[PDB]
């Protein structure tokens, strides 16, 4: 009985692109460039694209990359909700306890959807 719509994505993104096709659907962003945010350790049962190594760490937002449904929802066919994605820069020393002070300027940049962020 279950019928899957195999044309929805194409009709929506054709000539526009992904994630361009979700532009403006997230509304106003909760955070902006320069903000210091800490990664909330939300439950990761079954799926997540916010690496375990970033949980509880604080970084700096350097760019609002695009709007898109969270992978946690998109990966299960749920695209009704769209949110802002942020590119965040972490100091390596804040992720790995053993990082050497000799390489004090090393960093790691990665993207995280708004749901995982909270003001530092």
């Amino acid at each position: 009985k279950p019928v899957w719509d195999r044309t929805h994505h194409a009709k929506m993104a054709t000539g526009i692109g992904d994630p361009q096709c979700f532009k403006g659907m997230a509304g106003k962003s909760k955070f902006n460039v320069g903000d210091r945010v800490r990664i909330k350790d939300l439950p990761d049962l079954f799926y997540t694209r916010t690496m375990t190594y970033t949980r509880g760490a604080t970084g700096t937002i350097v760019r609002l990359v695009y709007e898109s449904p969270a992978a946690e929802d998109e990966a299960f066919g749920n695209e009704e909700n769209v949110e802002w994605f942020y590119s965040i820069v972490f100091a390596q020393k804040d992720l790995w306890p053993e990082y050497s002070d000799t390489f004090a300027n090393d960093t790691l940049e990665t993207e995280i959807p708004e749901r995982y962020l909270e003001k530092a």
Binding site: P2, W4, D5, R6, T7, H8, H9, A10, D44, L45, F46, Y47, T48, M51, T52, Y53, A71, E74, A75, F76, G77, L95, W96
Partner: protein, 156 residues
């Protein structure tokens, strides 16, 4: 010499097999044997490996198998035509497969199995149709009539 050095390097790799360890087999232990640490580790999302300790390896390139190229095309075409989105694929392919298959099988092996999986899970084909197609395909190969671009028919 080259022969000696090859045996040396073969030795350095072989001894890893004998690395002593406290090997505790798990046979459906009771809930009282599961700590929170173990629970989080067992319910982990397999693809999240960043930060795990690993050894240095002499990285190599690998030629693309014809079946890998065809698998890649099949997976993108299925997404192209709305059978799934790439994220649904990643979740099923890199996570749903579970820890053992995730690291025990080849990269493209997981892509292929998961392409077959999406067909069944979304009922585009019954598992019976898949099993039956595999039986027929095997016969096709064994009989000598060839298998697409993988094996030509037997001649004279």
């Amino acid at each position: 010499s080259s022969s000696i050095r090859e045996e040396v390097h073969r030795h350095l790799g072989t001894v890893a097999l004998m690395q002593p360890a406290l090997h505790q087999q798990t046979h459906a232990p009771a809930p009282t044997e599961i700590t929170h640490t173990l629970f989080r580790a067992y319910t982990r999302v397999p693809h999240d490996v960043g930060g795990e300790a690993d050894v240095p390896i002499e990285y190599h390139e690998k030629e693309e198998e014809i079946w890998e190229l065809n698998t890649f095309a099949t997976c993108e075409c299925l997404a192209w035509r709305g059978v799934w989105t790439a994220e649904e694929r990643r979740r099923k392919q890199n996570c749903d497969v579970g820890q053992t298959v995730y690291l025990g099988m080849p990269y493209y092996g997981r892509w292929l199995l998961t392409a077959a999986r999406i067909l069944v899970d979304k009922q585009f084909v019954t598992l019976t149709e898949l099993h039956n197609k595999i039986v027929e395909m095997r016969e096709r190969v064994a009989s000598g009539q060839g298998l697409g671009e993988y094996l030509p028919p037997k001649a004279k």
